[PDB]
Amino acid sequence: MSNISLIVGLGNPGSEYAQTRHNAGFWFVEQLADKYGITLKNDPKFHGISGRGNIEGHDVRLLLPMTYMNRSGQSVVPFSKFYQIAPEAILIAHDELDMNPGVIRLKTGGGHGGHNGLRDIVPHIGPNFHRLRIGIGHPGSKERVSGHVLGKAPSNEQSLMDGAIDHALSKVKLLVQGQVPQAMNQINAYKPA
């Protein structure tokens, strides 16, 4: 029922990380920001890059922590405390190992699912924020997980992921308008065209 007023993209800073699957949440938020002409500027007070503007009739903040993934909470937590944004108004976009490329899900609540960014966030604001789980695949062995999240995907997997992200961006109107059950049905029904 509450409007989404803060959208957070999780990822690592620097050009060596920018195309890595771990930066799926940066992809989503950076595309969104540019779709609506919202400028992401350096915001060192909150250890991130941040912005604010109109999306489909609503005042929305955007945040990319520049803390490195595992310390994402050092940006998100004080940012959302300072602007007094309840967790229920936060959507956090992140890579999801447990879903394949081309799969994308909106989830409300729950835990971190082993994701090391969310792991740094859930303890401080609690679990009740919305999550855009952008599927990146699982390599297979738990050995190869680090090299997979920190690697660039091949073009085919990338096109599926980018398709998923395009679809979720088309649904942000619902989310910022408070229409979370509808956004969720519609996001979660996505399948590659």
| Residue placing its CB nearer to Na ion in the complex, 37 or 110 | 37
State yes or no: 185 annotated in a binding site.
Answer: no
Instruction: Check: CB of residue 62 under 8 Å from CB of residue 38.
Output: yes
Q: Which is nearer to Na ion, 59 or 128 (CB)?
A: 59
Least spacing, CB of residue 57 vs Na ion, in Å: 18
Residues that bind Na ion (CB under 5 A): 34, 37, 39-40
Q: Which is nearer to Na ion, 16 or 34 (CB)?
A: 34
Non-local (6+) Cβ contacts of 145 within 8 A are: 97, 138, 139
Cα gap 3→160, rounded to integer Å: 29
Q: Is 54 annotated as a binding residue?
A: no
Exactly one of 22, 130, 148, 167 is catalytic; which is it?
22
Q: How far apart are CA 63 and CA 26, in angstroms?
A: 9
Q: Is 17 annotated as a binding-site member?
A: yes
Least spacing, CB of residue 33 vs Na ion, in Å? 5
Catalytic status, residue 115 = no
Which residue in 150, 158, 121 sits closest to 14, CA to CA? 150
Nearest CA to 104 out of 170, 8, 177, 155 is that of: 170
Shortest distance, position 19 Cβ to Na ion, whole Å: 17
Q: 190 among the known binding-site residues?
A: no
Catalytic residues: 22
Annotated binding site for tRNA: 17, 68, 70, 116
